[PDB]
């Protein structure tokens, strides 16, 4: 929701630009050496989601769970090089290769004593559990566990049956995942697909065989299992052995796509034709998700690149990345323009046609259920552990909740920023130059909410348009991978529209800094000064973005992108969490409610759990997070406030009448409006009921005051709203939603009409 | 190669714009020119080496 | 180039419509472009115009 003024975001937000993009200082954004029309129109991308629950119980397997714990690690920071420690892993693994006189010994005991070991006998395997631990020990104890996995690779299959018995789970539950991605994230996907393999050979199993696989026999048969280990592993090794190599020869293939789309290049600066050709790698040129991607890297880079094959490069490797064959990079081709669909996008514009203020918005959904779990222990100094939950509230609430969810649509949204035209003799675009844009994406404070860390430094992050660490640098890669989202789509987007696809390099402080883009176009329009302006005979043309934007015309986004919001473990058993004290919160709540009638104060508070019902509030049942919604709230609320602002002022300003007195109805009705909602949700019964105890409460303390018999008068409404309306406003605190501070401060600028309708007389 | 006449425009006459789309007809026409060029040429005197 | 281009015919930015636009023997006017042009041997440069 960062409002800019067109002609600046150099400065905007400073940083967060196409400039920015080169780095580039605030020199170039320019035109027009060479040009070069392409349009790569796919891109490989991703979807929604990247969260879970991922509970260990049973590994077997599958990845790809894996591989985002890894990234959670990777991400971590507590594994980067994360690759590396796959190596290291490898190794790992390799002297699981080492070892096997002991692994076997090891395992040898670990059922079961050994050397005539054979027959049906009775062989109560276990759970396995804490032996792994010593196989650790005689293990090396590299990250966490991989190591325990594979061991339940061997656990199954070491049961026919009976051969390890049961078993419990844990939990981990990644976290979510960017939608556009870079290189690093590239290269791993490969290497994981090696991961992958390498544990897809990994189950594989050897059956029951004989009388012996069969029916247990042979301490010389798991003498040979543990050959068998070995028979995995080595072939699980195997699979791995050539494949890896080419990182960052990777990035050079990129460099020389780059090179390729260079086009003013030296002549022995060419990729020859040979390879050119070569494949659909050259198709891969005229594949833009990497287009767009490399550059960047690139950026970093300064360039440097590997030389090496023409001929695996062409291009093996190369579709070695079949790119997508990793769905985990769930970068996978699209065709392009089957995003953006959250994006809608609708503006208020003037008359001569001419602009003013262009918003772009995000697509929601918010449906939501509640989470509010028993937050015990279970294992003591030690955290992992499940612990509950229960609905009692849950449901109430949400079920109350779900109504809220009525009424909200981002189309309401746009709606009332439609509300808030008007405009008159007022007020530009041509005016006095400079326009307005803002783009819906509370959406990534959200998560800063959930990253509980403070936005203002985000805002600065887009205010600088650069980094501004100060803190925890984990969370500032993270803000930064939502810029990069937040650079990402748009012009995508934009593009989707905008078959504006040519390239002239921009050379930047010279010349060699290849950053390609495209100025675009923009035809008709007779005129406009909005932006550092070309015209371009009225078709201004520039690789700067906004203003495309603001040549489309109000566009819709096409789906709202839903919202699916993970959720509990339900099969929730035993397993462990990961990252939740954070990630949760009690309930407690302070503040009231009350009021003073006839000159006598009627008196209430808030008193949690029996509005809740039941008994009886304590340090414990804890309630998980309410997000989404507090990203949403809170912008509903923002708008009213710069309304009245504004208006007041030119409410003030005012150098004719008419326009005054026009304004404020409309003002006006918006009031009622929300005070629809309010008391909309007041009449809930938990709500109601609230009034009851309220009342019944008030009255008591009244009893002894109260004398007079006056009768029907209140029947004049009031109360009934009028406490409900009130009530409304506890949900709001007991769920925090909006602050104390606000709300009334903004009820406080509210005060009338209310008699409205109504029958009045 | 060519373009055609299409819409009202490359069929009826219109836009500025498009000629404006034309001169980027004539880049679409360079390049791609230009592209089928691009590896291709290198080995002159090394063809005599063939030889 | 388009600019040059822009002129020859003729005169930019609204251009649009049915009008008239008796072009002509461009003849000449392609040793302007060629003047904006550098002048490589004969011209090459004609050829493409025709084009």
Redesign the interface.
């Known amino acids: 929701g960062f409002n800019l003024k067109v002609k600046d975001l150099n400065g905007s937000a400073r940083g967060l630009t196409q400039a920015f993009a080169i780095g580039e200082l605030k020199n170039q954004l320019s035109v027009g050496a060479l040009?070069?029309?392409l349009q790569f129109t796919r891109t490989f991308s991703a979807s929604m989601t990247s969260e879970l629950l991922w509970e260990v119980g049973k590994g077997n397997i599958d990845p790809v769970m894996y591989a985002r714990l890894f990234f959670q690690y990777a991400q971590a920071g507590g594994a980067l090089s994360v690759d590396e420690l796959v190596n290291q892993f490898t190794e790992y693994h390799q002297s699981t290769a080492c070892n096997p006189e002991i692994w076997r010994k090891l395992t040898a005991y670990i059922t079961g004593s050994s050397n005539r070991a054979i027959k049906a006998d009775a062989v109560g395997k276990v759970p396995p559990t804490a032996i792994l631990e010593q196989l650790r020990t005689l293990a090396p104890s590299e990250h966490e566990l991989f190591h325990h996995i594979t061991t339940d690779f061997v656990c199954h299959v070491l049961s026919p049956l009976g051969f390890i018995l049961p078993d419990a789970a844990y939990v981990y539950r990644v976290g979510r995942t960017a939608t556009y991605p870079n290189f690093y994230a590239l290269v791993d996907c490969v290497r994981a697909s090696d991961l992958r393999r390498m544990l897809t050979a990994l189950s594989s199993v050897d059956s029951k065989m004989l009388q012996a696989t069969f029916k247990a026999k042979g301490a010389l048969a798991p003498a040979l299992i543990s050959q068998h280990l070995a028979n995995a592993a080595t072939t699980a090794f195997e699979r791995s052995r050539g494949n890896f190599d080419a990182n960052a020869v990777v990035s050079s293939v990129l460099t020389i796509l780059g090179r390729l789309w260079s086009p003013s290049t030296p002549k022995e600066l060419?990729?020859?034709?040979?390879?050119?050709?070569t494949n659909g790698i050259d198709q891969l040129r005229s594949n833009l998700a990497l287009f767009i991607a490399y550059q960047d890297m690139v950026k970093q880079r300064g360039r440097a690149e590997v030389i090496f094959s023409d001929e695996e490069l062409s291009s093996t490797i190369i579709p070695w990345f079949i790119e997508a064959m990793s769905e985990v990079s769930p970068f996978k081709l699209r065709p392009i323009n089957e995003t953006t669909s959250y994006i809608g996008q609708t503006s208020a514009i003037d008359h001569m046609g001419q602009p003013s203020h262009v918003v772009v918005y995000e697509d929601w959904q918010f449906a939501k259920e509640i989470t509010a779990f028993t937050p015990v222990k279970l294992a003591n100094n030690s955290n992992q552990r499940f612990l509950d939950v229960e609905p009692g509230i849950s449901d109430r609430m949400s079920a109350t909740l779900a109504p809220i969810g009525n009424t909200f649509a981002v189309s309401a949204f746009v709606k009332n920023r439609t509300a808030v035209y008007e405009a008159v003799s007022q007020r530009g675009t041509v005016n006095s130059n400079g326009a307005e844009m803002t783009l819906g994406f509370p959406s990534v404070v959200e998560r800063d909410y959930a990253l509980d860390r403070d936005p203002m430094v985000a805002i600065a992050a887009l205010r600088t348009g650069i980094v501004d660490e100060s803190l925890e640098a984990r969370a500032s890669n993270d803000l930064k991978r939502s810029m990069f989202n937040y650079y990402a789509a748009v012009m995508h987007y934009a593009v989707a529209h905008n078959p504006e696809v040519?390239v002239s390099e921009h050379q930047g402080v010279a010349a060699e800094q290849g950053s390609l883009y495209l100025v675009w176009?923009v035809?008709?329009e007779l005129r406009i000064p909005v932006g550092y302006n070309a015209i371009e005979?009225?078709?201004i043309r520039t690789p700067e973005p906004l203003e495309a934007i603001a040549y489309n015309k109000p566009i819709q986004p096409s789906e709202v992108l839903q919202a699916k919001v993970l959720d509990l473990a339900n099969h929730t058993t035993s397993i462990h969490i990961w990252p939740w004290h954070e990630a949760s919160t009690e309930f407690a709540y302070e503040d009231a409610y009350s009021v003073t009638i006839r000159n006598k104060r009627y008196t209430a508070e808030v008193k949690e759990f029996e509005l809740l019902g039941l008994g009886q509030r304590r340090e414990r049942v804890r309630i998980l997070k309410p997000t989404v919604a507090h990203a949403i709230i809170q912008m509903w609320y923002s708008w009213f406030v710069e309304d009245d602002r504004t208006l007041a002022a030119a409410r003030r300003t005012s150098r004719d009448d008419a326009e005054k007195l026009a304004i404020d109805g409309r003002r006006m009705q918006n009031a009622v409006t929300l005070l629809r909602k309010i008391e909309m949700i007041g009449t809930t019964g938990i709500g109601a009921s609230a009034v009851h105890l309220a009342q019944s409460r008030i009255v008591d303390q009244m009893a002894g005051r109260g004398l007079i018999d006056d009768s029907s008068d209140l029947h004049v409404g009031i109360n009934r709203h009028r406490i409900r309306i009130w009530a409304g406003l506890a949900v709001l605190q007991m769920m925090g939603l909006l602050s104390r501070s606000e709300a009334e401060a903004l009820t406080k600028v509210l005060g009338d009409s209310n008699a409205l309708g109504m029958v009045v007389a």
């Open positions: 040009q070069l029309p060419d990729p020859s034709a040979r390879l050119r050709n040519v176009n035809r008709t005979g009225g078709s």
